[PDB]
Design a protein around this ligand. Structure first.
Ligand code: FAD
Length: 335
C-alpha cells in the first residue's frame, strides 16, 4: 500500500532501497534518476566499439579503514561473497596507508546495480524531479516530462545544491536554520577523461597520483587496476585537478578534451591515438568543507515523510554513503 520514492540511482539511493526491502513489507519501491543509466559519481563508461572495454569515470577504488571494518563488516563481506568486490592486487604510485584496498572487477557501477536488483525496486531513467508539492497529506512529485506522481515517503540522495534547485512546497518545508546549514555544504569540481584502445601496452604501475602537474591529478589503467587478463583493449582514466575543474566548468567539452589530451603527452609520451573518448564533467565532485553539523541525514517533514541523504551529510567515500543510508533508515523506522 505504501508508495516510497528514492530520488537518485547512486550509491546512497541504491543502498537505501536495498536496506528498505529488509526490516519491513508490503511496499511499492520506485527509484528515479535524471541520467540514462545508474551509478551517479560511481559510473562506468563503456566503449562504443565493445561493451567489454570499460572505464570508471568517477570513483576508482574502495579504501577500507580499520575503523569502518568491523563497523560496516556485514556490507563488505556481502560484496566479497558475491564477487562484486575483490582486493586490489595491482600497483598504484603515490598512495598513502592498516588500510585495505578493494576493486570492482566488472566496473565500479556494478555495486549500485547489485543493490538495485536486491531491492526489486522499479527503476526509471531520464526522470528529473522538478517539483515536490503537498496535496491531501501525500506528495505530488512533478518531472521534466510528463505527468506527476503520488507517494507516501520520499528520500532525496542528490548533492545538496541540487536539492535546493527544486521548486514547490519543499522550498517552504525547509526552515531558515536548515536552509543555512544546507547552504554551508560545498563540493569541489573536476573533469574526467575516459580513453579507449584496442592497441595494448606501457608502465609498471596501474594507477598514479600526480601533485606536480597543473592540469592532471590522477591517471589509471582501468583494465590493469581491475586485473582483466583477457586479450579487450586497454582503458585510460584521467582525473583533473580542482583549479582546472573550476576554471573550465562553463567551457566547451571539445575544448577541455584538447587541454587534457595535450597534457597527457607531457606525463606519458609514446601512446597511440585512442579509438574512443568520453569526457565527464563532475560539477559536484567531492564534499570539501560541508556537513553542516556532521549528521547522516536531514528530515524535513514527518507525516508524510521526506528526508535528504547522501555525501553532503557524511564524507565523499563508500563508507560515508553507507553511514548516510543507515541514518535515513533509522529515521523512517517508526513510519
Ligand atoms: C572524480 C571523483 C573521484 C572519486 N573517487 C572516489 C574513490 O576513489 N573512492 C570513493 O569511495 N569515493 C570516491 N568518489 C565519490 C563517490 O563516488 C561518491 O561519494 C558517491 O558516488 C556518492 O554517491 P551519492 O549517492 O551520495 O550521490 P550521487 O552518486 O551523486 O547520486 C545522485 C544521483 O541523483 C541523480 N539526480 C540528481 N538530481 C536529480 C533529480 N532532480 N531527479 C532525478 N535524479 C536526480 C544524479 O544524476 C545522480 O545519479 C569520487 C567522486 C568523483 C566525482
Amino acid at each position: 500500500m505504501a508508495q516510497v520514492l528514492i530520488v537518485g540511482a547512486g550509491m546512497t539511493g541504491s543502498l537505501c532501497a536495498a536496506l528498505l526491502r529488509r526490516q519491513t513489507g508490503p511496499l511499492y519501491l520506485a527509484v528515479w534518476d535524471k541520467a540514462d543509466d545508474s551509478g551517479g559519481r560511481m559510473t562506468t563508461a563503456c566503449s562504443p566499439h565493445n561493451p567489454q572495454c570499460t572505464a570508471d569515470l568517477g570513483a576508482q577504488y574502495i579504501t577500507c579503514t580499520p575503523h569502518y571494518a568491523k563497523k560496516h563488516q556485514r556490507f563488505y563481506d556481502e560484496l566479497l561473497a558475491y564477487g562484486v568486490l575483490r582486493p586490489l592486487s595491482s600497483p598504484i604510485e603515490g598512495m598513502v596507508m592498516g588500510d585495505c584496498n578493494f576493486v570492482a572487477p566488472q566496473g565500479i557501477s556494478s555495486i549500485i546495480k547489485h543493490y538495485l536488483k536486491e531491492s526489486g525496486a522499479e527503476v526509471y531513467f531520464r526522470h528529473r524531479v522538478t517539483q515536490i508539492n503537498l496535496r491531501d497529506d501525500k506528495w505530488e512529485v512533478s518531472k521534466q516530462t510528463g505527468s506527476p506522481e503520488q507517494f507516501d515517503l520520499i528520500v532525496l540522495t542528490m548533492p545538496v545544491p541540487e536539492i535546493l534547485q527544486l521548486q514547490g512546497d519543499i522550498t517552504t518545508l525547509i526552515s531558515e536554520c536548515q536552509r543555512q546549514q544546507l547552504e554551508a555544504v560545498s563540493y569541489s569540481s573536476r573533469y574526467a577523461l575516459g580513453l579507449f584502445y584496442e592497441a595494448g601496452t606501457d608502465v609498471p604501475w596501474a594507477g598514479q597520483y600526480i601533485t606536480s602537474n597543473p592540469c592532471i591529478r590522477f591517471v589509471s589503467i582501468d583494465n590493469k587496476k581491475r586485473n582483466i587478463e583477457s586479450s579487450i583493449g586497454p582503458s585510460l582514466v584521467i582525473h583533473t585537478t580542482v583549479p582546472f575543474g573550476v576554471t573550465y566548468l562553463e567551457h566547451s567539452i571539445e575544448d577541455v578534451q584538447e587541454l587534457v589530451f595535450q597534457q597527457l603527452e607531457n606525463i606519458l609520451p609514446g601512446l597511440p591515438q585512442p579509438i574512443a573518448t568520453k569526457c565527464q564533467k563532475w560539477r559536484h565532485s567531492q564534499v570539501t568543507n560541508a556537513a553542516a553539523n556532521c549528521p547522516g541525514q536531514m528530515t524535513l517533514h514527518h507525516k508524510p515523510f521526506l528526508a535528504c541523504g547522501g555525501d553532503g551529510f557524511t564524507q565523499s567515500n563508500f563508507d560515508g554513503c553507507i553511514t548516510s543510508a543507515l541514518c535515513v533508515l533509522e529515521a523512517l523506522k517508526n513510519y
